[PDB]
Curated annotation (Swiss-Prot):
Effect of residue 145 to G: 18% reduction in hydrolase activity for both 1-lauroylglycerol (1-LG) and 1-oleoylglycerol (1-OG)
UniProt entry tagged with the keyword Acetylation: no
Record flagged with keyword Cytoplasm: no
Name of the protein: Thermostable monoacylglycerol lipase
Listed PANTHER family: PHOSPHOLIPASE-RELATED (PTHR11614)
pH relationship of activity: Optimum pH is 6-8.
Consequence of changing residue 196 to N: Loss of enzyme activity
Role, per record: Hydrolyzes monoacylglycerols, with the highest activity occurring with 1-monolauroylglycerol.
Similarity remark: Belongs to the lipase/esterase LIP3/BchO family.
Subunit-structure text: Monomer.
Organism: Bacillus sp. (strain H-257)
Temperature remarks: Optimum temperature is 75 degrees Celsius.
Entry keywords, A to Z: Hydrolase, Serine esterase
EC code(s) of this entry: 3.1.1.23
Length: 250
């Protein structure tokens, strides 16, 4: 790591080695493993080997984030997939928002993957930096708007500023991912928050149409905003995913 700053408390990765079925969990662009930990812990308790990496540049400081490329984030996820592949003979991938993009990405590169569970995955965002920069303002940083989360008793540990260099990287990742949806053939379970105010719910439909997966479904989350893994629909996400995992374990 060319990471210059230490890991925030609560942002540590999580590994657990249980049975031969594995789940890789991928957190999002602003966030840290915190947003995915309740899922990871529930899947580990159900008997799954679980890998929840901390993406390079995340969970430290926004300056660390600034120098990373999407290639670094892919590498973090690839190394998590590799850790799982050593230990498991069945692999599922799930992730929130950008972690959903990275989940799609990984499925495109490894069809040995037995299934994917993207949640509010980002594939085509019109408002990249919705009204902080124009095409030629080019501030270094945009102030972050806060968490799009309904439940007020939980929180994200995401940075307060987003490097605009990182947004460029994110747009490039979404392009290479959306372009290659047809490469995905494993079972897909697609969560979408009706009231996502960050990633347009229509991304669900683009994912659904673009993959060549024969077993695919869209599940609507009615009581959650964008950060659904921490929101009121958390238990529903966990219970439906567990059902998904069991029914496709190989
Ligand atoms: Cl977080």
């Amino acid at each position: 790591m060319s990471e210059q700053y230490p890991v925030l408390s609560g942002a540590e990765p999580f590994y657990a080695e249980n049975g031969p079925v594995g789940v890789l969990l991928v957190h999002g662009f602003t966030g840290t493993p915190h947003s995915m930990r309740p899922l990871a812990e529930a899947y580990a308790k159900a008997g799954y080997t679980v890998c929840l990496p901390r993406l390079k540049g995340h969970g430290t400081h926004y300056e660390d984030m600034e120098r990373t490329t999407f290639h670094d984030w892919v590498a973090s996820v690839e190394e998590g997939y590799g850790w799982l592949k050593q230990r498991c003979q069945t692999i599922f991938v799930t992730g929130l928002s950008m972690g959903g993009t990275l989940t799609l990405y990984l499925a495109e590169h490894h069809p040995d993957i037995c299934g994917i569970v993207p949640i509010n995955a980002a594939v085509d965002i019109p408002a990249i930096a919705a009204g902080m920069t124009g095409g030629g303002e080019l501030p270094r940083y945009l102030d972050s708007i806060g968490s799009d989360l309904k439940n007020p008793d939980v929180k994200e540990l995401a940075y307060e500023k987003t490097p605009t260099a990182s947004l460029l990287q994110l747009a490039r990742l979404m392009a290479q991912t959306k372009a290659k949806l047809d490469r995905i053939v494993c079972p897909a379970l697609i969560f979408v928050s009706d009231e996502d105010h960050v990633v347009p719910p229509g991304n669900a439909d683009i994912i659904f149409q673009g993959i060549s997966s024969t077993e695919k479904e869209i599940v609507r989350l009615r009581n959650s905003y964008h950060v659904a893994t921490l929101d009121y629909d958390q238990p529903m996400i966990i219970e439906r995913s567990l059902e998904f995992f069991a029914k496709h374990a190989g």
